[PDB]
Nucleic acid binder design. Sequence first.
DNA 1: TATAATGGGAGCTGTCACGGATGCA
DNA 2: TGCATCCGTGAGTGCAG
Lengths: 47, 94, 325, 1111, 243, 142, 8
Amino acid sequence: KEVRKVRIALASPEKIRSWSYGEVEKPETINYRTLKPERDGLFDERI
Amino acid sequence: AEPGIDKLFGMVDSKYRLTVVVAKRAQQLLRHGFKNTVLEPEERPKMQTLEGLFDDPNAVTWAMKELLTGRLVFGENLVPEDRLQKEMERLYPV
Amino acid sequence: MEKTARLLDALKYYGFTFSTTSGITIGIDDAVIPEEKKQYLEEADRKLLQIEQAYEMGFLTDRERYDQILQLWTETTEKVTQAVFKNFEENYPFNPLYVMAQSGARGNPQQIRQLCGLRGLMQKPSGETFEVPVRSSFREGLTVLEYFISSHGARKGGADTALRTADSGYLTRKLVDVTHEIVVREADCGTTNYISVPLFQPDEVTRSLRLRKRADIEAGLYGRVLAREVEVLGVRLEEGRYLSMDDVHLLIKAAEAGEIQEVPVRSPLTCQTRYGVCQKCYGYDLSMARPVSIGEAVGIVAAQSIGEPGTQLTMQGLPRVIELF
Amino acid sequence: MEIKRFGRIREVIPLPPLTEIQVESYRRALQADVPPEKRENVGIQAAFRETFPIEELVLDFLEYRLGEPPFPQDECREKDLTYQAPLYARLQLIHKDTGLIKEDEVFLGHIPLMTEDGSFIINGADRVIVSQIHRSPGVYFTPDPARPGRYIASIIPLPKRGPWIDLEVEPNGVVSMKVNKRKFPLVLLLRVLGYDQETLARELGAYGELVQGLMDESVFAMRPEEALIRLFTLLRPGDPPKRDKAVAYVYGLIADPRRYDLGEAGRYKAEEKLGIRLSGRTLARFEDGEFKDEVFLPTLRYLFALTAGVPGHEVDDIDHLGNRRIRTVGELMTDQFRVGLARLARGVRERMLMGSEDSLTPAKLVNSRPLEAAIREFFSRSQLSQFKDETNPLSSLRHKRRISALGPGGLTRERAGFDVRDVHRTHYGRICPVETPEGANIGLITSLAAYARVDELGFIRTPYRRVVGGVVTDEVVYMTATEEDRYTIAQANTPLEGNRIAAERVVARRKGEPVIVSPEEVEFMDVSPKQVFSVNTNLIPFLEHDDANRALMGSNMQTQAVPLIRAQAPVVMTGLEERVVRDSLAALYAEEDGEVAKVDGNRIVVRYEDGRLVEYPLRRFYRSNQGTALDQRPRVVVGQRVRKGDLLADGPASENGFLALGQNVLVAIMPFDGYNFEDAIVISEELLKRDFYTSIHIERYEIEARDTKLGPERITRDIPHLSEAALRDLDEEGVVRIGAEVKPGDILVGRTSFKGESEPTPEERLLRSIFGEKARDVKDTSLRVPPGEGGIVVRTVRLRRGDPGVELKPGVREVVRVYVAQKRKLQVGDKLANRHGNKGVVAKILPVEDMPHLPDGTPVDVILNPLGVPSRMNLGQILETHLGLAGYFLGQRYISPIFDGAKEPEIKELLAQAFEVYFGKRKGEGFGVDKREVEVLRRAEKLGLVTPGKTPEEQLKELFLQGKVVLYDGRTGEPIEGPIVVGQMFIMKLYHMVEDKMHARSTGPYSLITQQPLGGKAQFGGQRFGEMEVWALEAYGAAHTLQEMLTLKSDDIEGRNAAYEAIIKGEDVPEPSVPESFRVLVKELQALALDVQTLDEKDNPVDIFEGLASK
Amino acid sequence: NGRRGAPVTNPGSDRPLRSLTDILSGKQGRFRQNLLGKRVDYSGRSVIVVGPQLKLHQCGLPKRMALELFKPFLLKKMEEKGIAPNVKAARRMLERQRDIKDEVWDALEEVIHGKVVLLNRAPTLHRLGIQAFQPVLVEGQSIQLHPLVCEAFNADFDGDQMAVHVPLSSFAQAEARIQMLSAHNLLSPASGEPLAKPSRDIILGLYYITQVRKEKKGAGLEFATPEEALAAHERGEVALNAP
Amino acid sequence: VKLHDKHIEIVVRQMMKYVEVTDPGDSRLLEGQVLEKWDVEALNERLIAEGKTPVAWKPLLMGVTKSALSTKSWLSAASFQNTTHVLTEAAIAGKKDELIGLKENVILGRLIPAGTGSDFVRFTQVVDQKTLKAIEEARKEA
Amino acid sequence: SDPVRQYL
DNA sequence: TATAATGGGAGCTGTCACGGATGCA
DNA sequence: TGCATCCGTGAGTGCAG
Ligand SMILES: Nc1ccn([C@@H]2O[C@H](COP(=O)(O)OP(=O)(O)OP(=O)(O)O)C[C@H]2O)c(=O)n1
Ligand SMILES: [Mg+2]
Ligand SMILES: [Mg+2]
Ligand SMILES: [Zn+2]
């Protein structure tokens, strides 16, 4: 179908969670040796 | 200026409806190999290569000259879109 | 258009070859200091201490003196600017400055005056003018002091063009954001409402009606659409007619005669098309001197049309526009 | 050839050393040549005595020293190091209780040194520290813009060395006080200092108006230490006001000469202003238990007596140059130094009161790094540390003499009003009124007048000769703008007999206003006209015929003049062209008398009368910041007997020692068939023939070979899938051979890098399975040449590690730099300009047969259209030609001083002496007048140029005197229907060449988050199609063309990839999907808890992520 | 960040961190810097330079700019003749400058036939900081602008530069030729007056040839008969154009 | 500076686009509430239709800045200026932008509603008579 | 106002 | 992992004009 | 209720950088 409007409105907490794929538990970025993403962190790929 | 533009603006009710008719017709020809053209081999737009004269590739140059001939019809709600897009792929294949 | 284009390359071509063989040049000897100059310079000093004495004898104030020291020197500047052009057109009518300014190829009287006559009264940083004018010409050469005095003005204008630009630019962006959705969405919105352009301006000099300047009437009328019939000097201008540049010049003449005082015109101040305007209430696509094609983004055109001049608007100046918009 | 000088002004003193502001200032802050004993508490030293001694255990400061540099200027230049000195500081720790004494000299790091020409090398890149102009420390009074009859008083210290305090007298009669934007009644403060209600009237006692109003004994009902806590309440809403902490706060704000410094200047200014001496650079004192005010009552005195009517209480012009002042480089860097020392002391006392209070030293109680990084910072990212402008030697000298009102401690762009930018009456002779930039920075960046110098307090001042009686002394004296206003100062060119003022009217200023006055009334006289203008401005002949607004472009464009291989000094000069080469420290001279031993493209050795054999070597073909070959050439031969101060080698843009920013050309002034249009320029192919307007340029091309997690990077000659053709110019290691021709596409350095987790995919493993060549594991990452560049490999530097001398940033094995030269002939697009503001782009190069030419067969070099002159009002260029005509036939150059140069008769006389050469030569060689010269003369007569009834020679004479000559179109032989202005003009090639600026992109790199193409030539940019362009397309109604710019050409990754397949395949371009950048917008609003939803017409969502975000 | 109280800086500098609203808003925000206008492909810049030989609807495009800007199209045509076997090898020819053979350029000339490009100059104040042109190739770097259009762009040749934009679709090409081509846009949309019109040299050239001498010698004598008037002029006592 | 009045008018017309309520009659509006002059004239028809009382309103003159920030399309208004104030208030009201104007479609990147993109012209067809007659003949009989 | 003097 | 230690530290300055929301005689 | 007064938001384009 064909886009014809653009709605903007508030995100219920449930909805925010509706978007999510992962709770970012750790404030870790990527492993200081593997240079790959640490799990449960901001770049974890399982999320 | 574009050869014979003042008369082009005379056919349409608004300059932008010429542009759309041109650009549409221009592409009917690009995909079809021009075979649907309503020109005769002497009216053919010709470019001059180093070897020698050849048919103009620019499908818009064509479309505009074509428009002047009167051999085209313009307007809204004249055909089903899909009955055209094959009756023409039938009459002039890709 | 097709022909005017060919017409134009034509004027392009010949005007260019002629320009070169014509022999036009600039040598220092073409800045003709008219000799009427020193008459006017001498005539000034005597009248200058003609006022330095109605104060030297405490006859009236400094605020009085200055006020009148500088009216002297401005109408002096006028005089010698004239003698520059009288002396040109009467004696050396093919002089390159004269030719160049006269055709509109470059230059204008006030610059040319500063090549040939005097530079004039200069500005002080505040905004007040020096009562000493720089009497040197650019041909003659300035005193270091004259050069310095003359520096404040140019810098204070350098800063002007740099700040101002920011406002013109900002002003344009507002204009676009407020008009952008305005397109020519239909042929006629059938509105029976219109506006009446006056051809007469109610004075306070005579505080009678005087005709309005031609260019101003051209700008209220050219390309409009009459919302009612008009019958003047035996001509019948019909409802629905797009006033041509000649239809306009006619009605000015009908108004000079007394047959018309205000022309009823289909304005966009009164279009009832939603989100845009219609054809009739708009008028010509001025770019094409003919009625406007449905689909023209007039609002954007409007904005670009009002913003592009202000750069380029020297005071009020552009401010007053902004205070109004 | 002969050099005729004009001008009657005997200039007493010379121009001073034009880098002095940069050299004198720094050395005066280091003192690296003063025996520590004999040093003086200013600059580097003063910062030491400020931060020390560190207080409870107490660490004290003995002396500092400086060592010579680890490496010499060039060495640092090459190796991307800094030209710096080691800083040692001898310290003695002593124990607050036992008498402990330890004493070490601890290394603080390296301070960067200043070269001779007054610049710096920072990570091997010359830079300049632009002086900064700012308001000066002191106390000022300024009318209140609200209430017409009341006046704010302001107290201002050096920046970030105290708070600003205002003393507005409110509409409630009793006086106020602002600090950190907190207002409160003043009396509370005066109390704290020990003040008594009577000693107020005892001192004010005049203005029952408010002297009696200021008093309010709701406050007087306290002792000094009482209100002291009264106030701490008013500035710290929440801190418990203990009498050990309230004394600590105000002291640390108003009397602690450790974070409150009025200037040294600020002392003297408010000293003589308020008429009171001053113990220190400090508002209040702490002496014998309590506070003893210094400034607040004196200030209080002025303000009040102003608001009634008192004499000698003037408001202050804060833009006056007695109240603005200059932070030269030395001062600016010491400030940063007082900030490292400050941090270093925060860290010593920290380790004083933790770690072991008796087994400690100076050595381990000091961590230098906080100092190191504060210096490094000021020099590597300040807004006053600028990449040096060494386009030509003038651009470098003008830089060192620039003045920014911007920067840390000054104005933000938005802060800048008009008054800061205006020329001030006091700029006269201090800051040039011409040399400023057009645009946003207009009036903030300016230049140092040519005769001007900044005094020890940091004020600009300018010289004036003292005239006594009516006779003019040779005693010159430099005045701040303030003492200037005291005198009646007559103009530089007031006429004299010997040294007496001949004229009966003299042209003078009092307080900058112009006044006509008798020689008895005159106290000083300008030194020279050159004293009002920038250095560049002073290079402009006939400046007084040029409108200001294009003298300014004439000034600036100079600094843009590209060094030319056949460069020559202007046939019309101003008399500075020689000094400028001198102080530009680019030309090379003789240290004492002697004789030339050897001479050579590479070195010059000279035997001196002192038996010394000094050998000066020649900086030959050095690359400058801007790429413009900085080349030194020798100007003496073996045996040449040389007096002292004579020349030995010409710098760049120097021709026997005169500043040669361009070339003198034969210029014809006429329309030329379009190719003159709107400032375009037409040139003769003969200019490229004899290699005029040709310049050498070099671009550095660096590359690094680094250790990776996937392997190392190898600099090799072994690059897979590449043909021996594509390698024929590389040595065995992979470096191009010095002396080669490299053009776009060419490898300069082969490099190999290992392939990632995309080690061949099926599609690719299989394709090679066919070709019997199995997957190679390295990659061609070589350094090629970018589009539109290329030249002749001139040099290569190879820095490895594992070699001696060298060690690079972590993880890099080896780095290779290869410098590439290009000879640049002038070409269609390059930009030309003359010192009068005339500028244009070479638009056409005719062959010599089309050039206009004069009857004796000679063809003009340049055709400048006359439409450029009238509106620009820069007539000086016109004179420059006329006297250039003369000089072209008398074989002369001229020196026409600015404002005191060659006038019109004096040059018309020269123009006749040249006529005889041009024509008399003829009438004797067997040729008379010509038939086309008569047709022209027929015309000239109607014009009125010539006197009717006069011999052809008589009449050609008359035109020649007018700068005008007969001219034949070489396309026809027919004359120009008129007589033209032909002459000799000095015209430079500017840095703005088409080669640096032609760029285009089909497709290229993109941006991480936006997926839109990068910008700039060096990234292989795309062109920004901004809001105003979009509008343009919008107004036209080009919907599809706009949509294209918004999707297929920028970031509609689907239809973009989709198009570049359709073109290469010959099919029309696909209709586009949604710009990937709108998506970024959605997700960025989600990340703000905002739910943006694309909806079809029946109001149900549309997944513009094609399910990639659904679950 | 910054909205309330102190702004969060990283250690060792005073630089506010860039909060989500900072990203969204301001002149460098997401809307104004990436949505209401992006950078673009198939576009270039160079110095402009007057070409008086140009016809109203044309401009001077350096052939090297041309090659890149049309690189897709050239790659194909390069095959549809045979200057290379396929498109991928065709591309590798033009990647090092030596490899470009002369019939590449004849191949490009073929390519751009009939189609127009867009020229933009510095401040697009109105609809005409952009106009469309048939490009004729040229050696040398500089762009060639037509003298008549310099006014609308406010272009002179003190060193101005202009931007070039290749339309792609048959619809964008049809838009530029019909609506945005110079020769069709001769009147201003603001006043309706002409905007392409003679200026500096062009009117100087025509004024000269169309002025008329007014000479002062005869000074208005009274002669009854032509017969003698000529004679007097042949005498040299009355200049040819004296009234 | 010759400059056709019609341009200034178009702008000025937008400056007058809004109105202030002075008695809601029989509507959900509220004295002082501002809204587009179109939208009150709109439903004052819906009220003369169901015969109820009409909204008393009042002309409003806004300047250009306020008049753009007050536009319906929150995408136009947000991208103008005052982005957070714009964005918060629209989200709260769950504003749905109809994509009527130009900036709206510029940010989405769709064909703008002007020129070649105007619904008045974008749907036009072009067929050569030797294909229009070709297809009209088979389609005459079933 | 100042989240440290607060906790202090 | 155990002497005893008990409330921070750096402000930053020379723009402006308008519109809205809040405090106050 | 009318009017100080503070807080927040703006302040041209592209290119080199
Ligand atoms: N900050 C700036 C500086 C310049 N420009 C562009 O460059 C033009 C400036 O050139 P000028 O010489 O100052 O203007 P001209 O109209 O060309 O002057 P003249 O009549 O003497 O030719 C204006 C403008 O198009 C600009 O847009 N913005
Ligand atoms: Mg220009
Ligand atoms: Mg210009
Ligand atoms: Zn209407």
